[PDB]
Design a protein around this motif. Structure first.
Motif, PDB file in Angstrom:
ATOM      1  N   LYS A   1       0.809  -1.221   0.000  1.00  0.00           N
ATOM      2  CA  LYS A   1       0.000   0.000   0.000  1.00  0.00           C
ATOM      3  C   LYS A   1       0.841   1.269   0.000  1.00  0.00           C
TER       4      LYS A   1
ATOM      5  N   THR B   1      -2.248  -2.507  -9.282  1.00  0.00           N
ATOM      6  CA  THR B   1      -2.385  -1.222  -8.614  1.00  0.00           C
ATOM      7  C   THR B   1      -3.841  -0.938  -8.221  1.00  0.00           C
TER       8      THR B   1
ATOM      9  N   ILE C   1       2.375   1.712  -3.447  1.00  0.00           N
ATOM     10  CA  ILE C   1       1.343   2.283  -4.316  1.00  0.00           C
ATOM     11  C   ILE C   1       1.154   3.775  -4.061  1.00  0.00           C
ATOM     12  N   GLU C   2       1.176   4.191  -2.795  1.00  0.00           N
ATOM     13  CA  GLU C   2       1.126   5.612  -2.485  1.00  0.00           C
ATOM     14  C   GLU C   2       2.311   6.367  -3.087  1.00  0.00           C
TER      15      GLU C   2
ATOM     16  N   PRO D   1      -3.996   3.075  -1.757  1.00  0.00           N
ATOM     17  CA  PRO D   1      -2.726   3.569  -1.240  1.00  0.00           C
ATOM     18  C   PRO D   1      -2.862   3.944   0.227  1.00  0.00           C
TER      19      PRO D   1
END
Length: 230
Positions: free
Chosen positions: A191, A221, A194-195, A226
């Protein structure tokens, strides 16, 4: 020239067995095993290794295997990991992880990014995952705090070093058993990656590394939200 690493620490191996460098005849026998071991002959080869590689040579062997082989021979990571498992020694395993962490520390702490061999870094990171997560053994928070390391790397403009280190380690969770998603620790790191992919405005190759990692878990994704640390 080095930089500090706030969220990476190497512990000392606790050991009462005096460690020695291997004599020439032991080195010869050990190299013979490493150069001829296959999946098919593994058990017999490890039996042979045990006759030569006694515990007083475990530190020597770990330094040798990690720095001379694992660092440069990714195609042999699975096989070498199986050799360590077959040896059946917790002490040997501890030395292997220790040397790997020390080698990773040197690379991650190198101030000049151009002086870091990226393939050696990725190889050592994948190897660390091979002998920890892939064997259902954790990487301790007291040694590597992954989320903190990533956030710090964002702040210090070190993501080109830290991201591939994280993704190559974490890919080894993909067949784990214990560490596959939905393991919250694994998912938490995903996560955050992804952020960072959304917010860091980073080089394309880092997006690639994150995509490769997600794919290893049969995720995308779009499949995760995120974090919001950044």
């Amino acid at each position: 020239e080095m930089i500090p690493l706030k969220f990476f620490a190497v512990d000392e191996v606790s050991c009462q067995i005096n460690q020695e460098g291997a004599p020439k005849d032991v080195v010869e026998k050990v190299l013979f095993v490493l150069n001829n071991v296959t999946l098919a002959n593994l058990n017999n080869k490890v039996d042979e290794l045990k006759k030569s590689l006694t515990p007083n040579y475990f530190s020597w062997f770990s330094t040798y295997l990690v720095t001379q082989r694992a660092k440069t021979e990714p195609n042999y990571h699975d096989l070498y990991s199986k050799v360590i498992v077959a040896m059946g020694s917790g002490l040997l395993h501890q030395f292997m992880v220790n040397v790997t962490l020390r080698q990773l520390f040197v690379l991650l702490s190198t101030k000049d990014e151009q002086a870091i061999d990226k393939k050696h870094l990725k190889n050592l990171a994948s190897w660390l995952g091979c002998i920890t997560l892939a064997l259902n053994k954790p990487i301790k928070h007291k040694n590597i705090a992954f989320r903190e390391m990533l956030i710090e790397a964002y702040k210090e403009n070190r993501l080109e070093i830290v991201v591939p280190f994280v993704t190559k380690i974490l890919q080894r969770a993909s067949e784990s058993k214990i560490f596959k998603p939905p393991n919250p620790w694994t998912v938490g790191i995903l996560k955050l990656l992804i952020e960072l992919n959304e917010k860091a405005n980073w080089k394309l190759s880092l997006t690639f590394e994150v995509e490769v990692l997600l794919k290893s878990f049969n995720l995308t994704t779009k499949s995760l939200k995120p974090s919001n640390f950044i």
